[PDB]
């Protein structure tokens, strides 16, 4: 449920990630800096703390909390309660992470007010919520 | 929008596609013989004629009827409006095929008395419905 | 060892196979149109009479003479008497095809003067020498 | 030239890079403890310190040197001066590392007279000897 790669100051490329899904719970990426800052988090709540199948970004500093909620329309989760497996690429860019699932972009996320790359870890978290099938990690990827 | 491959008889192996998919309409996939019966259909019902999200599953002879229809869940139907990319490969059993959708198996079809393979047509049919993203087909394999 | 695709008019596109290299002998690649005219043949030559490792481009009218031979280089055939997995993909241009392995561009073939598309069969075909490992074909894919 | 990842204590699955392989020099690859030993090194030498497309594996301790080298047939170093993509996994099994590539098992490697797992570095070098194609990296992967 968790387990995370540890990069070279990563100014460009993408970092990836295949898992399966699970049924209830969320799964979320962490993009960490040097001071342990939130450069940007990508939770997928499949069934959490009272909403289905939302996607939220957000970006915090290590000390103060989070910023303003990004819920892009785009993420993949399956209907019906299914499950299925879910590529994620989240590239890092100019004036932005840009965000895609599946090869189809979701959506650009322009760094946040001060909080610029590099990425240095990239983390990976299931927290279930009672979950009748739970997410299985497949790989974690660095790009260049 | 309708498309195919024409196989040597093939009794072993496997056919794969690979669409974004629409958020209304269907999308079917037909594996024929000689005479064009339908050995198997796979049926998507992203929004069609009354059904959201249904996975039909059914074979019939060339000007036949119908069977009874199979209905299998675990299809990543996205959701909320979603569109896709999907990857669905059909094993061509020695018993029947076997579904499978991004990596994972969904369902073991026993040929249909009288519909065995060799199959030699593999074809993908998108049918609109109002959808504001149809469906665009990306690649249509055989596996040996 | 020798196996195909037909499909529908192909005039934009590409195709693809996928197989195991054999240390001897050779795989050719045909791309026909209606009249089984050859439009363009890919011969991958491990060791084929008397050459090794060579790659022979060219196009033929059904029943009519070969015309000047093309031969690229770039193509990963493994040294060293060695067998590999490789990827070939042949995009059908508006001007000639492009050849491909490995994710790696080899050549631009512009098409025979009158042998245009459209392309409606892919065929691989492997021919033993004295290979102590034959190829074996994996994959066959249009791609749209 | 120099990249790498760093892991949770990976006893076991697998890591894997992809690379654009040069026509001279030589692309090593580390598995390192936390101690910071060698626990691997797989090293494709394309054109090196007088050798051809020959590939080396061998494991040393931080302070000591070198132990036996392993030369395995079977790595897909191009002929005839070539560059290609090469896919390499290292699987980390129970008895020792398993090496394949592009999908193809090269060899069983036992581990090393007390240097057991886990792997928590992953590393890529490519260092040139004059090449008119330098070596490309495009990922570096964890698998679970
Ligand atoms: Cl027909
Ligand atoms: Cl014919």
Redesign the interface.
């Known amino acids: 449920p968790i387990?995370?790669?540890?990069?070279?100051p990563m100014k460009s490329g993408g970092l990836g990630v295949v898992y399966?899904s699970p049924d209830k719970g969320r799964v979320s990426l962490y993009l960490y800096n040097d001071g342990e800052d939130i450069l940007l988090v990508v939770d997928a709540r499949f069934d959490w703390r009272g909403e289905?199948?939302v996607l939220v970004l957000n970006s915090k500093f290590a000390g103060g909390e989070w910023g303003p909620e990004v819920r892009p329309?785009?993420?993949?989760?399956?209907?019906?309660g299914?499950?299925?497996?879910?590529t994620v690429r989240v590239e890092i860019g100019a004036d932005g992470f840009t965000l895609s699932?599946?090869?189809?972009e979701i959506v650009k996320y322009p760094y946040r007010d001060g909080l610029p790359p590099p990425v240095t870890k990239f983390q990976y978290v299931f927290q279930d919520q009672g979950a009748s099938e739970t997410a299985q990690?497949?790989?974690?990827?660095?790009?260049?």
């Open positions: 387990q995370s790669i540890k990069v070279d399966r289905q199948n329309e785009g993420f993949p989760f399956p209907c019906c299914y499950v299925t497996t879910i699932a599946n090869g189809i990690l497949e790989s974690l990827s660095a790009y260049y």
